Swiss-Prot record, chains A, I, N:
GO biological process: protein transport
Entry similarity comment: To S.flexneri MxiI.
Matches recorded under NCBIfam families: PRK15325.1, T3SS_SctI
Lineage: superkingdom: Bacteria
Reported function: Required for invasion of epithelial cells.
Organism of derivation: Salmonella typhimurium (strain LT2 / SGSC1412 / ATCC 700720)
Keywords: Protein transport, Transport, Virulence
Record's keyword annotation contains NAD: no
Keyword Transport: yes
InterPro entries recorded: T3SS_SctI-like
Protein name per UniProt: Protein PrgJ
Lineage: Bacteria, Pseudomonadati, Pseudomonadota, Gammaproteobacteria, Enterobacterales
Curated annotation (Swiss-Prot), chain B:
Function summary: Component of the type III secretion system (T3SS), also called injectisome, which is used to inject bacterial effector proteins into eukaryotic host cells. Forms a ring-shaped multimeric structure with an apparent central pore in the outer membrane.
Coiled coil: none
Shown residues in whole-protein numbering: 155 to 307 of 562
Effect of disrupting the coding gene: Insertion mutants are hypoinvasive in the HEp-2 cell assay.
Organism: Salmonella typhimurium (strain LT2 / SGSC1412 / ATCC 700720)
Descriptive protein name: SPI-1 type 3 secretion system secretin
Record-stated family: Belongs to the bacterial secretin family. T3SS SctC subfamily.
Subcellular compartments: Cell outer membrane
Assembly description: The core secretion machinery of the T3SS is composed of approximately 20 different proteins, including cytoplasmic components, a base, an export apparatus and a needle. This subunit is part of the base, which anchors the injectisome in the bacterial cell envelope. Forms a stable homooligomeric complex. The complex is composed of 15 subunits.
Curated annotation (Swiss-Prot), chain F:
Consequence the record notes for mutating K62E: Can secrete only early substrates. Can assemble needle filaments in vitro, but shows a filament assembly defect in vivo. Can invade cultured epithelial cells
Protein name: SPI-1 type 3 secretion system needle filament protein
Listed result of changing F75A: Abrogates host cell invasion and effector secretion
Family matches, as InterPro entries: T3SS_needle-like, T3SS_needle-like_sf, T3SS_needle_YscF
GO biological process: protein secretion by the type III secretion system
Result of altering K46D: Non-invasive phenotype
The keyword Secreted is annotated on this UniProt entry: yes
Binding partners and assembly: The core secretion machinery of the T3SS is composed of approximately 20 different proteins, including cytoplasmic components, a base, an export apparatus and a needle. This subunit polymerizes and forms the helical needle filament. Interacts with the needle tip protein SipD/SctA. Interacts with the needle adapter protein PrgJ/SctI, the secretin InvG/SctC and the minor export apparatus protein SpaP/SctR. In vitro, the needle protomer refolds spontaneously to extend the needle from the distal end.
NCBIfam families: III_needle, PRK15326.1
Annotated family: Belongs to the SctF family.
Outcome reported for the amino acid change (mutating N51A): Exhibits constitutive secretion of substrates. Retains the ability to display SipD/SctA at the tip of the needle filament
Additional information: The levels of PrgI/SctF are reduced in an invA/sctV mutant, probably due to protein instability, and are increased in an invJ/sctP mutant.
From Swiss-Prot, chain M:
Gene that encodes the chain: sctF1
Record annotation: effect of changing D8A: Exhibits constitutive secretion of substrates. Retains the ability to display SipD/SctA at the tip of the needle filament
Protein function: Component of the type III secretion system (T3SS), also called injectisome, which is used to inject bacterial effector proteins into eukaryotic host cells. PrgI/SctF1 forms the external needle filament that protrudes from the bacterial surface. Is probably involved in the transduction of an activating signal, thought to be mediated by the distal tip of the needle filament, to the secretion machine. Required for invasion of epithelial cells. Required for the secretion of the effector protein SptP. During infection, can induce innate immune responses. The needle proteins interact with host TLR2 or TLR4, and induce signaling by NF-kappa-B and/or AP-1. This activation is MyD88 dependent and results in increased expression of cytokines, including TNF-alpha, IL-6 and IL-8.
Mutation effect (F13A): Can only secrete early substrates such as InvJ/ScpT, PrgJ/SctI and PrgI/SctF. Can polymerize into filaments in vitro, but not in vivo. Cannot enter cultured epithelial cells
Name of the protein described by the UniProt record: SPI-1 type 3 secretion system needle filament protein
Length: 90, 127, 75, 125, 78, 76, 68, 78, 90, 94, 60, 75, 77, 90, 59, 75
């Protein structure tokens, strides 16, 4: 509920080149990831957060979600590259 | 038209699912022919206990899951299907009366039973 | 958000007030550590808490392993 | 037509599974010939205890799975387990309270009346 | 509504079983403290205090046994 | 409508006919008169018997899940 | 679902329902013992399904590669 | 039939082994309560109360030992 | 015991209804309907359903089948062109 | 059944006669293989959707075999078909 | 199917009286043996059909 | 049959009568719980039975583990 | 200097029995001077018993939370 | 030990051509393979042998030797056929 | 071999399960037997994996 | 005989005569169970024997773990 924002009419009268679509995707993903890693590490360092059941039960979910997200991005990327190889490769 | 009817009908159903429609009535009943509490007679040689109506009924209904009916001596059915084990009876000596918590039907059946059970007693003179 | 947080939350909306009750009972007991009436209540609340937190965590673990298996079979 | 019939029938069927049709009734039965409670006699050198009807019947039916029938000296609703029958003695009026299905109540009543028979007096000299 | 678990109910079953022992103990105590040397009061107190002791013990041992069943089941979810 | 680990739990629940209620009954009686040694002696037996019932049930279902998961792993 | 488009109940429902019931009273042994076996059967079903879908796709990929 | 396990069989062996003690104890108590100063009633009560005490002790100690033997086996199914 | 039946004389196939679904390699309309649904969706319902095991088991079918369909078309075009070149040289 | 054994008096085989054409001999193969595979795939699927089959070791052990036999069958039909067309291609381009 | 039948018999006898130590002692053994049997069978089935698949892949 | 059954039965044949020595000494004691010679007799039989069962179970467990660790290497 | 959560659980007891930690040593220093005074014996029995219960309940309570926390942390795998 | 017999004398044959040397090597391998597979299958279902550490230690080896032998025969056959194919294509 | 020594230690133990001197001897024998069996099986597997890998390499 | 046997036998030789001393002193006590000299002599011997057996078993246990943990890494 804190600081929500959404873009509208994203494709209604302008379209990006694929060259840019890839670049925006990469950037928006890489920064979110790096911030999530820092958040986890900080929640581990603070002595008041690693010793309270309420805060540990929150940290378990963060680690689970990070691990699932990075695994899904990696698998889809590998599979999509494979198809371009099968197209170009004589 | 078909897509808007399917969607709207489903979302309304899910908005209603949370409303609780069951109500709990309280009935107050005066006893006319007997004391409400349990009675213990401390005979010179014997201790004897007689349980009151409240105790005996709370003991009879204990843990029952099916609804009561036919006592002898769309949502409607969902409401009617109220478990017997929710009936609660509290003896109030100050006014010789019973407090009964349950659905309106349960309250009615309980009342009929009460009026079957507080008959006035005869006297016997022994010479 | 996510489904694993949905499962985690389905407990916390299940135990309405326990999270508060435990701390409140602790404060009372700490005020008079030798009242058996207080002790008896705290034993119950603390046990109910220990069990709630263990059941929650093991369930989240299991659903995490189901998803991690499926995302491998995507390959 | 076939597809409409099939789906309508299946969903009307499923909307009823939550409905319960069984019910419980209460029978009040006065004992005409004997004391409801367990009797106990205190004697100069002896104590004797005799169980009542409620005690004996409960001790007999306790744990029973099968329905009862034929006491001798949709239908799913009918097949209530005997172990659901409950009996409570009410000495205040010398009466028995019975909870269960109508056939059970009936059988119990027949059994009670098979048992509350008055005694012959004997004088010894 | 004040939520209450299964162990809560097991505990409360004793409290509602012993209707008033909880206060009879205190009144007996006050009466004794007023006149420590009356045999009838001493005899009453000995009984009530003993009864209270046994009640509290039976309660805590049953609550623990149920806890140790449940922990042994939720162990096997893994 | 149910699997085979429910058939295996239900073999215990129908095996010990009535214990599940007998425990609650015994507790209802003892709660009324904790100082009675005949009630105490009865309850000790029922509660112990129930504790073993539950442990044996849960460990058996755990073992059958370990056999099944290992067979399924070989479907590869 | 409440919906059919013209042209029993599964483990996915039964698990969601037993979890929902359990979470109301996490310390009741009857409910716990009823939930262990549903969560186990759901784990087994949801593994076996995915492993066999994977086998059928690797068969078709091998066919296409063999005729390359 | 009321279902009975093994523990409640072992426990019942004691109950039927001491045929009548359970009632003999209360009979002796009611006489003693009728006349506490009679030494012939006193000396008869002592033997019964002692027999009862020992009976109950042996009974529960045995039930506990068996429960420990069974739990130690069930621990090895896993 | 209960409800037992067996067909004795002839091997009339009954586990499946025999149908024109025998005579095609890809249910291209079922692909085109699924690919529609996972692409018309732009800022409606929600993103990131990496995590629910019931929808995550539906995505596995589509992600595989569209990769196979695209791989097949790549071979068919090479075959066609190669057949034309083979005839024109010979 | 399990309490019965059922033979054939003597196995004469009319289908040992070659009499049909080289193409009818092809259509039989194609039609029979297509039906066999569609039936097998359906059966395997049902054995997994049904909850009493997918959770009993006795049934799982059988399903493992069904899956492997399916795999081997399809892989061999594919291989032999490729080898066949490859022979034609080798000769005609020579 | 003898070792499949024996375990279901043992389970019924046990379920009849879960606290009898002689029954517990018997069931522990039967269940352990069944547990080893299933694993051994599944693993060898796998090996035998991975060899066939590797043959076909060799000429394919 | 099986091999773990032979291991387990080897104890049963090692102690000839113990399984029904216990039941008999119990039946004797239950008749006169206060006789010290009977109490002293029962204490040793029940101890022996306890140890017998423990050893029997733990050995079957160890052999199970060795077999499972070998079967794991068929793959 | 960093207080965790267990530290806070413990300090709840310390700040609960505000003065008992002094009262025990002062009642001891009274009694040791004149061990035969019934008033002093009666007092010290009470304060000593209280101090025993307080330290015991404190240590058990810290242990239970330590055991919940470890059981959660083991699932991070 | 009990009910046991061995064949003392093998039947014999002339070997005069590469044809017969080939059929002989084929027949020699086929039978050894069938015998081994059957033996292993039985050792997996006699319950005195499935559950005894000494017997399991043997079955492990038998399985391994089977795997290695059949993989060798497969490889060398395919190498020979590939050498013929290569020379005739050249 | 070790197989017989373990079998015989078991036979002597089962005669008198309550004798400490017999128990201490059995613990030691069963322990060594367990280690031996595990080490043997792991080594066999390793050698077979190497052998298989060579074939997979030239295949 | 392996290394574990050696570790056990180091205790057996480290205590020279304890086993026979215990067997003897028990028979002297059983001949006159009410003599305080014999009672005092026996308590100490039995205590020593108890500690000896415990230390021996716990040590063999630890070594087994170190070995099994190494053997696991051959794979
Ligand atoms: C003709 C070639 C056309 C495409 C060529 C680029 C090949 C890479 C395509 C990879 C597919 C991406 C699939 C990601 C799946 C996903 O959902 O992640 C989204 C994920 C998050 O999605 P979100 O919800 O939008 O935030 O974002 C990513 O991580 C995107 C990954 C970007 C990595 C691309 C790296 C580019 C290297 C190739 C550059 C070489 C150019 C040479 C051209 C070909 C040779 C002639
Ligand atoms: C032309 C040459 C075709 C080569 C046939 C290879 C036989 C493969 C085999 O033996 O397995 C049979 C296999 C199994 O039958 P079974 O041997 O009776 O068990 O049946 C098949 O699947 C054959 C499928 C044939 C499809 C060939 C494609 C023909 C397309 C030409 C259309 C022209 C209009």
């Amino acid at each position: 509920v804190i600081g929500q924002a959404v873009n509208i009419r994203s494709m209604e009268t302008d379209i990006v080149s694929l060259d840019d679509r890839l670049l925006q995707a990469f950037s928006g993903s890489a920064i979110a990831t790096a911030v999530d890693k820092q958040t986890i590490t900080n929640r581990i360092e603070d002595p008041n957060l690693v010793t309270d059941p309420k805060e540990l039960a929150i940290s378990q979910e963060m680690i689970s979600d990070y691990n699932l997200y990075v695994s899904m991005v990696s698998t889809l990327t590998r599979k999509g590259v494979g198809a371009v190889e099968t197209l170009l490769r004589s | 038209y078909v897509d808007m009817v399917v969607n709207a009908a489903t979302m309304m159903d899910k908005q209603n699912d949370g409303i609780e429609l069951g109500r709990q009535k309280i009935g107050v009943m005066r006893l006319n022919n007997t004391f409400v509490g349990d009675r213990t007679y401390n005979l010179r040689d014997q201790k004897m206990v007689i349980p009151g109506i409240a105790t005996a009924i709370e003991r009879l209904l204990q843990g029952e899951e099916q609804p009561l009916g036919n006592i002898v001596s769309l949502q409607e059915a969902l409401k009617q299907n109220a478990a017997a084990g929710n009936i609660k009876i509290v003896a109030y000596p100050d006014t010789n009366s019973l407090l009964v918590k349950g659905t309106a039907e349960q309250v009615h059946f309980i009342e009929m039973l009460v009026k079957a059970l507080d008959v006035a007693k005869r006297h016997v003179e022994l010479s | 958000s996510g489904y694993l947080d949905d499962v985690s939350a389905k407990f916390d909306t299940g135990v309405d007030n326990l999270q508060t009750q435990v701390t409140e009972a602790l404060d009372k007991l700490a005020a008079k550590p030798s009242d058996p009436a207080l002790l008896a209540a705290y034993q119950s609340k603390l046990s109910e808490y220990n069990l709630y937190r263990n059941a929650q965590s093991n369930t989240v673990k299991v659903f995490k392993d189901i998803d991690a298996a499926i995302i491998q079979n995507f390959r």
